[PDB]
Design a protein around this nucleic acid. Structure first.
Lengths: 198, 198
DNA sequence: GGGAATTGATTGAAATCAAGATAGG
DNA sequence: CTATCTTGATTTCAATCAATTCCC
């Protein structure tokens, strides 16, 4: 129905893993990471949510990943129960909720293949192409997250990510204007470094 | 509504990647693997579907993973269009379909953490515990798949999986009655070798 | 009998350990 | 100024390469 606005500071938790899934959120400005942790501190980031993306939608009762703002972020949010009510009233709403979860599933399925099977360079080339599609403006990606967040998204250390980016820069495949301002100079070459579907 | 029966031989493809998602399936007997391939032959298994499990449900128009019988398998299946009609007629059907996809998402989220962050031994212990919960009979797991399928589910080589299983055996954690007949002797010790949540 | 599994030897890609260089605040 | 990022040195865990052995 009606959304309400809210903002979170860089690094503020928006919800925790296993916390009640009481609201559903949409990024207006900024960026959010969703992740799971192990007890010794190892962290897998499952997804980055960028402006316009919806997150926190759960069919069940609890958030299965924690979510934190990467940088100061403004979101819109709606009560989960308000969505459940609308879905009951309107077959089209119910179908759109399922579609949202299905798109999350498709992203996770592709991401399992990356984490289980791709080389470090393939993973970084995949990542740069995904970000270019999602956030490039007039050819340039202003990436909101650190090298440690990129590594924890890709199942790699930040040093390996840095090394792959350095190599791509030396080869003329990308340009830098500072470490997180990246301009892809040849998407085709970079596409050739990811792994290809059978 | 009305399900029909069908069977597939060991290694027969049930549907391909990117193929039209025309039917939804439930294992009655046997076992199925869902996977994605890369062009050089590398393979990530996203899930094993065991008796009673439903698979091949897509919100979108096509299968995002291929599916193959691991051993001779009997399934029940229904037309996807038949499900879409029931879901339009009944709010609880629509809701169950969303819940199915959401359970697949929860599995894939956990599995990303495993593929991105768990050591080889943690992955194998996770796998044995998952299979014990889903398929043990009076304490013993008759695993339907090869070591190569296990490694492709866990982002490991079959040799690494063999070594971890050998080690668990030598430590008294599991028993063998042949390679794929496994009896967990101490689930607590094995749970301690998986990695724990924060 | 023969694909599957175990086991051993070795390599290798990414992690870890360790300085510096960079550049946002 | 101080995190973040890059780069280098070295280690390590799992992969790869290579025979046997065990069972279906």
């Amino acid at each position: 129905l009606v959304a309400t606005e809210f903002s979170y500071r860089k690094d503020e938790e928006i919800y925790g893993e296993d916390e009640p899934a009481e609201y559903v959120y949409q990024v207006v400005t900024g960026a959010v990471r969703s992740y799971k942790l192990l007890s010794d501190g190892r962290r897998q980031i499952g997804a980055f949510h960028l402006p316009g993306d919806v997150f926190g939608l759960e069919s069940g009762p609890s958030h299965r990943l924690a979510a934190e703002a990467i940088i100061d972020t403004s979101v819109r949010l709606v009560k989960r129960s308000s969505l459940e009510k609308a879905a009951g009233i309107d077959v089209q709403v119910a179908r759109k909720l399922w579609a949202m979860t299905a798109g999350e599933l498709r992203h996770a399925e592709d991401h399992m293949l990356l984490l289980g099977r791709k080389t470090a360079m393939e993973r970084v080339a995949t990542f740069l192409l995904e970000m270019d599609r999602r956030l490039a403006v007039a050819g340039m990606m202003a990436l909101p997250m650190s090298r440690r967040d990129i590594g924890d998204y890709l199942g790699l250390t930040l040093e390996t990510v840095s090394r792959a980016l350095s190599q791509l820069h030396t080869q003329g495949i990308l340009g830098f204007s500072g470490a997180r301002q990246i301009v892809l100079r040849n998407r085709q070459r970079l596409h050739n470094l990811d792994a290809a579907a059978a």
